[PDB]
Amino acid sequence: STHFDVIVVGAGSMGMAAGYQLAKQGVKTLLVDAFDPPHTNGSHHGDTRIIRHAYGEGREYVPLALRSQELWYELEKETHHKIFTKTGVLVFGPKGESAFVAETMEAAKEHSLTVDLLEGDEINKRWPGITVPENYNAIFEPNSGVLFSENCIRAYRELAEARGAKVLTHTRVEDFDISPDSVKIETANGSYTADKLIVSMGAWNSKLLSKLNLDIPLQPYRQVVGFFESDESKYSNDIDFPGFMVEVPNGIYYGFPSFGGCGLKLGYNTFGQKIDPDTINREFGVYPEDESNLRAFLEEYMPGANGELKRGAVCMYTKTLDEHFIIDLHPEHSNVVIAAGFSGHGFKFSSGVGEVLSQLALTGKTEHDISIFSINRPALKESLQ
Ligand SMILES: *Cc1cc2c(cc1C)nc1c(=O)[nH]c(=O)nc-1n2C[C@H](O)[C@H](O)[C@H](O)COP(=O)(O)OP(=O)(O)OC[C@H]1O[C@@H](n2cnc3c(N)ncnc32)[C@H](O)[C@@H]1O
Ligand SMILES: O=C([O-])c1ccc[nH]1
Ligand SMILES: [Cl-]
């Protein structure tokens, strides 16, 4: 005989943040997760995540990125877990041949963000360890950096539970039963009811949203990252090697400086295997592209960090057709909030989204402008059953 004010299905990056925001307000919340967050089955492991402010995916994300940054600073002061390191983020690519680089620069200009603009040999000179052609240009953002994503979720969870939130782990939600005055979920461990529901199952939204009469194109992608033994005198966070996201002819790559000798971490963002979250192979190296795509980049742009592979991780992106998020109320149920399709670039915003989700669930509205994340926008090609 236990109901709840709000139920969060999927206590990961977005869900746990929401749980923390709700618990802080004394809202009796229940968070249900198929596993035990943080874990290595979803989209939040791999240890680190980049947070950028000058948004190359679109300047409309800036306000949320800035609020998220402030919230990350708040979390740092609230927990013993490490949350953020200001490595700065470097963005580069061939001059005049990168929409990403261009939009990043424009976003920086339009929002009066503090950035450094350099090109060619200036890049190589400032950051020994980086070798780009003379025709390359870049924009460096000194105030953005790296988030320790697993620590973020763990901190949010510990804070939320301490304030009353309940977390039901290793419990997969299998169905939903929504009424105008309440919401109900069904699991093998029991059924639960509340006044409001927040759906944030990550990669699994592409399989379970149909249970909510929603037909939205969502494609999960297998994305790997590798840690490589590197020249610490050049790639360590200690010597200010920055986090980065760059565009080269074959696509977009991202990386992190070596922290305490863990080695430089690199990822190839443009490519990934289309998969099912329930049958995805989470072993690094099973596909020759896993390690080959990464070394091809390192050999050309960061030769000193192309050493032995120290560690590998397999994680998932969940893309929408326009690659913009989905944060909105269910079109037929104002008491249901949806957080989906973060298309590989949503963790940095998770703190902000947690606040947005909490507001939508409790009031049906949010102070933040989330118009570009509308669940009813045509660019999504959504529908119902
Ligand atoms: C994969 C990846 C993503 C990524 C990245 C590097 C890699 C390799 N680097 C990033 C970066 O530098 N900066 C950034 O802003 N984003 C970056 N990303 C993307 C980001 O990690 C993802 O967008 C984010 O983690 C998405 O969060 P979301 O909360 O959607 O996904 P989750 O953390 O996986 O949580 C979902 C949870 O729900 C649970 N679940 C699933 N099914 C069920 C059912 N049936 N019942 C109950 N719970 C369920 C999962 O267990 C999971 O915990
Ligand atoms: O959003 C990002 O900064 C990012 C890096 C890799 C995937 N997403
Ligand atoms: Cl994602």
Swiss-Prot record:
Q: What residues form the membrane-spanning segments?
A: none
* Binding-site positions, FAD: 5-35
How activity is regulated? Pyrrole-2-carboxylate is a competitive inhibitor. N-(cyclopropyl)glycine (CPG) is a mechanism-based inhibitor and inactivates the enzyme by covalently modifying the flavin.
Q: Name one GO cellular component term.
A: cytoplasm
Keywords, sorted A to Z: Cytoplasm, FAD, Flavoprotein, Oxidoreductase
This protein's cofactor list reads: FAD
Question: Sorted alphabetically, which Pfam families does this protein's record hold?
Answer: DAO
Q: EC number(s) for this protein?
A: 1.5.3.1
- In this UniProt entry, the residues modified to S-8alpha-FAD cysteine are C315
**How does the cofactor bind to this protein, according to its record?**
Binds 1 FAD per subunit.
A single Gene Ontology MF term assigned here is: sarcosine oxidase activity
Catalytic reactions of this protein: sarcosine + O2 + H2O = formaldehyde + glycine + H2O2
- What enzyme category does the UniProt record give? oxidoreductase
According to its UniProt record, which protein family does this protein belong to?
A: Belongs to the MSOX/MTOX family. MSOX subfamily.
Protein function: Catalyzes the oxidative demethylation of sarcosine. Can also oxidize other secondary amino acids such as N-methyl-L-alanine.
Q: How does it assemble?
A: Monomer.
User: What name appears for this protein in its UniProt entry?
Assistant: Monomeric sarcosine oxidase
Q: What is the lineage of its organism?
A: Bacteria, Bacillati, Bacillota, Bacilli, Bacillales
Encoding gene, per UniProt annotation: soxA
